[PDB]
Symmetry: D5
Subunit: 58 residues, 10 copies
């Protein structure tokens, strides 16, 4: 998996309350977090399918 999959989730400075997915390398799966709407980092997926595929395997 890409190293960015090891990043902690990043809400960002904006004020929306949007459900996004991040890879939790300890749990070995993707989990939800609240994304603020701007300045996303790469461990942030709109689709849980994309999170699993991008980050699931190494």
């Amino acid at each position: 998996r890409p190293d960015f999959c090891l990043e902690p989730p990043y809400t960002g400075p904006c004020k929306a309350r949007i459900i996004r997915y991040f890879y939790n390398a300890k749990a070995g799966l993707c989990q939800t977090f609240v994304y603020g709407g701007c300045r996303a980092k790469r461990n942030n997926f709109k689709s849980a399918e994309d999170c699993m595929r991008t980050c699931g395997g190494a």
Copy 2:
């Protein structure tokens, strides 16, 4: 039916207000609850189809 289906719904600490589904054992069907956006337990489904099949029967 998995045992996690018997747990009460868990909103969690986060501040989003997102519709999710949980199995209500007492009622014998899936129902809606408000999910906060993080730290979900297993009695938590984005899709009602998934909730029924996983926790029903």
Copy 3:
């Protein structure tokens, strides 16, 4: 993990070609398959989040 997470994915006899998710116990991850639209088995999820969470651990 629910035992149904260990079932091979099941398309069924119907003629739709719908993306669904199943847990691959060998690979230890959810993957897509083509669902026919009827007679689903339990290792079949509309949502990928539901697949990962229900069939993880």
Copy 4:
């Protein structure tokens, strides 16, 4: 539970292949079927939430 919940699912004459939900009384939950796109009967829900609440209990 409305009586229409006890009818078998009805695909109809049209040629689309669309996932819908119907209540399976024998099984005591909603299930998927393929809907053709026209001439629907009432045991036909776009949303699984709607199916459970309308036909469950």
Copy 5:
């Protein structure tokens, strides 16, 4: 028509502000209301198609 189609719409005690559909028996049509996310009554539809079809006739 199911009798539950005659219930006034019910927001419930939860704090989400989600669009749902209800049948207005007086007007003879489905209309929107704001659903709070928990303790739904049956005159509550995620899909407008489901509302019209379930509560029509």
Copy 6:
């Protein structure tokens, strides 16, 4: 309601098999039909909410 709400549903010449809604003035509600993807007439709604509101009352 607009007169176009009295039109019979129109699939059109294209080959997609898309669910759309039309107002059935006899039934007094909107029903599904299969839309082909092109050359829509006005009694054709992507959302069933829009069909009810646009065509429901006179």
Copy 7:
């Protein structure tokens, strides 16, 4: 086009913050507005395709 296409957008008294489309007759196209979730008037569409087709032309 139906005369309801000439009305200003109507949020209504309810407290949701939902994106809907209204036809802007001066602009000749549909635009977004915030709908409150109840007491809709007819110049209010869930889908932009529906808005533009219904209030399309003359």
Copy 8:
């Protein structure tokens, strides 16, 4: 109005049958067409909001 807004809708060579939106310069509005799933030209919108705003 971007010049690509005046181009005819392009289905392309692929075999999917998916509703997309295109701006019809003559009609003065966005309409539906069938998109094959690959090699999209720019007069091709998944969202009708985007079509009207971009091309209208």
Copy 9:
């Protein structure tokens, strides 16, 4: 690239909190911003496909 692609994202005066896409000319790609629900400028896409194709 249409010139509107070079404009900064515009939230507007309305009170909704909705994810939209804008083309960031500097970064050379589309990114998310919060849109208030009214008075959208053209560098505003509901679909990221439309943003990349239109502005990329």
Copy 10:
């Protein structure tokens, strides 16, 4: 960017006709392809936002 962003799009052996996004490294952006529903490779995204963020830059 992850090296999987360099692979050509992969339809796979299954028979569905689903729209997915792949990163076109030469073009510098994501484009649509038809996915068959199984045996996905990693340059395959349900959401265009995810594709562009994951395979974004270098």
